[PDB]
Amino acid sequence: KIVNIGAVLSTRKHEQMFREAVNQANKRHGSWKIQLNATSVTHKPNAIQMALSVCEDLISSQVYAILVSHPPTPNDHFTPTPVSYTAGFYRIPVLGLTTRMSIYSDKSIHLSFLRTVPPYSHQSSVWFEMMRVYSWNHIILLVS
Amino acid sequence: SIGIAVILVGTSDEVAIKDAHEKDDFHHLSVVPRVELVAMNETDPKSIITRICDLMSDRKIQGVVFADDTDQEAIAQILDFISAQTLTPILGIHGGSSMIMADKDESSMFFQFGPSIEQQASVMLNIMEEYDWYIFSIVTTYFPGYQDFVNKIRSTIENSFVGWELEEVLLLDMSLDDGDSKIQNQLKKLQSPIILLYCTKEEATYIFEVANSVGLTGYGYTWIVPSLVAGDTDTVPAEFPTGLISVSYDEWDYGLPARVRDGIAIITTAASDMLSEHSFIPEPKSSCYNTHEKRIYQSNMLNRYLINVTFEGRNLSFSEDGYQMHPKLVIILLNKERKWERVGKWKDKSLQMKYYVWPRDDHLSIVTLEEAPFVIVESVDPLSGTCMRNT
Amino acid sequence: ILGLQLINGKNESAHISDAVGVVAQAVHELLEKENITDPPRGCVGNTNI
Structure with missing residues (x-):
């Protein structure tokens, strides 16, 4: 049967290779009745445009995996919040791509979440490996 | 002016409710209460995103009262x-x-x-003193809202003149499969006669199964559950043991038309204070299109002027968490059969138990007398509620 | 000022290529048990979990 995978990306010109990218992996999987097909929707930087294009297109496509991209603005976090909101009650599996914030990391809400990129919060653990070797026994702290 | 449209979903009789809407004696301020009655089914999210935003754009709608009658886990x-x-x-x-x-x-x-999360820690602590329930334990798992609740209960223990009995805290994992061998052994470590639990009935159906498997509920074990565990009195999966006692928001003593009329009253009386001093009302865009760029007129005044809201002489202040923090709680005990029956009530931060001794050898009785050097009787200290430790 | 960076965190082409690859074999592992039912069509009809 035809298998569709959800995706949330903008710049359909860039998404053209994504149709081919999944096509390259289409012949790789050993499934006999599952055939992955690209199913992506335009990322509109506003919640109103997506207020009428969720149930009609996304869920109706029987998509099992969802990919969420980032907005063109480097400093923004309002793009991936509704995608995980509509895929949590139906519990549709999702897979993040540009996961830089820590909103979906407390496990209180939207438990089904995958991060292919560590958020900003993970930089503290790897920070040990520099302070301890480079002396600096006594350290001050500043935070916003 | 202002307008409020009610969103009624479920099985009810809106004919009687609609009569009370146009019966307010609001001659103090020109509220101009616009009344609209909506009653339909919106279980699927598809209809919600296509009907809700159209209602608010009818005529400057700035108030919604919404209710259901089911126990869905995704309504709110x-x-x-x-x-x-x-x-x-x-x-x-x-x-x-x-x-x-x-x-x-x-x-x-x-x-x-509903009462706040920390308010559930101030109800069972007041009742455990009366019936000599001085020993307790906590079982829960990874849940959205357990981290803050467990901090409050232990905070009140230290600042007291009377010791408290605690027998471990259990946080057994439930997400991992094949956990039967990892729960029965840990459940054996629990020996306190009174055990408190914090779970959800949808996922706690396994909790009673393992708990009743080891059978640590024979005669001296009593289960107390919060409001959300029971969910509904009618909804009984026939798994609870006889004699379960619970505390939950009152529904028998608080009817349908009383609560819905309070919601419209709270919003309408909130705008009266704003016009009392500033004599102005913000006018944002009344459309569900490009709302992000049309939110210039911030409503911060309404949020900061809600704490001083009263109805019928009773304070109903709402904090930033959106809770009244003083609701009516009912002490309700499951009967011999699978029927939930009210026993006590909570009001004025006080407890009025109908009985004095919990319903029924290791529990004997003694009779003593006042003697000079042997048995000394002294009154109860009022500062700590109870009398004193070591007596 | 001492800066830092994490490699392979900005190549969106590499991330999606690995994302489909890891789930392609996970699909093979998925079809090995019972109670494997397709999600209901649409969203209006679906009311349960």
Whole structure:
């Protein structure tokens, strides 16, 4: 049967290779009745445009995996919040791509979440490996 | 002016409710209460996103009262996005909108019916003293809202003149499969006669199964559950043991038309204070299109002027968490059969138990007398509630 | 000022290529048990979990 995978990306010109990218992996999987097909929707930087294009297109496509991209603005976090909101009650599996914030990391809400990129919060653990070797026994702290 | 449209979903009789809407004696201020009656089914999210935003754009609608009658686990947060999107005041009355929420956005203003999470820690602590229930334990797992609740209970223990009995804290994992061998052994470590649990009936059906498997509920074990565990009195999976005692929001003593009329009253009386001093009302865009760029007129005044709201002489202040913090709680005990029956009530931060001794050898009786050097009787100290430690 | 960076965190082409690859074999592992039912069509009809 035809298998569709959800995706949330903008710049359909860039998404053209994504149709081919999944096509390259289409012949790789050993499934006999599952055939992955690209199913992506335009990322509109506003919640109103997506207020009428969720149930009609996304869920109706029987998509099992969802990919969420980032907005063109480097400093923004309002793009991936509704995608995980509509895929949590139906519990549709999702897979993040540009996961830089820590909103979906407390496990209180939207438990089904995958991060292919560590958020900003993970930089503290790897920070040990520099302070301890480079002396600096006594350290001050500043935070916003 | 202002206008409020009610959103009634479920099985009820809106004919009687609609009569009380146009019966307010509001001659003090020109509220001009616009009344609209909506009653339909919106279980699927598809209809919600296509009908809700059209209602608020009818004529400058700035008030919504919404209720259900079911126990769905996803009812409340479907409107959290709308509250996050638009500053329209939306209040949850019944149904799935009677839940406690862990974290809310600063722009997602919302009011929910039900006591706060920390308020559930101030009800069972007052009743465990009366019936000599001085020993307790806590079992729970990874849940959205357990981290803050466990901090409050242990905070009140230290600042007291009387010791308290605690027998470990259990946080057994439930997400991992094949956990039967990892729960029965840990359940054996629990030996306190009174054990408190914090779970959810949908996922706690396995909790009673393993608990009743080892059978540590024979004669001296009594289970206390919060409001959300029971969910509904009628909904009984026939798994609880005989004699379960619970505390939950009152529904028998608080009828349907009383709560719905309070929601419209709270919003309407909130705008009266704003016009009392500033004599102005913000006028944002009344449309569900490009609301992000049309939110210039911030409604911060309404959020900061809600604490001084009273109805019928009773304070109903709402904090930033959207809770009244002084609701009516009912002490309700499951009967011999699978029937939930009220026993006590909570009011004026006081407890009025109908009985004195919990219903029924290791529990004997003694009779003593006052003697000079052997048995000394002294009165109870009022500062600590109880009398004194070591007596 | 001492800066830092994490490699392979900005190549969106590499992330999606690995994302489909890891789930392609996970699909093979998925079809090995019972109670494997397709999600209901649409969202209006679906009311349960």
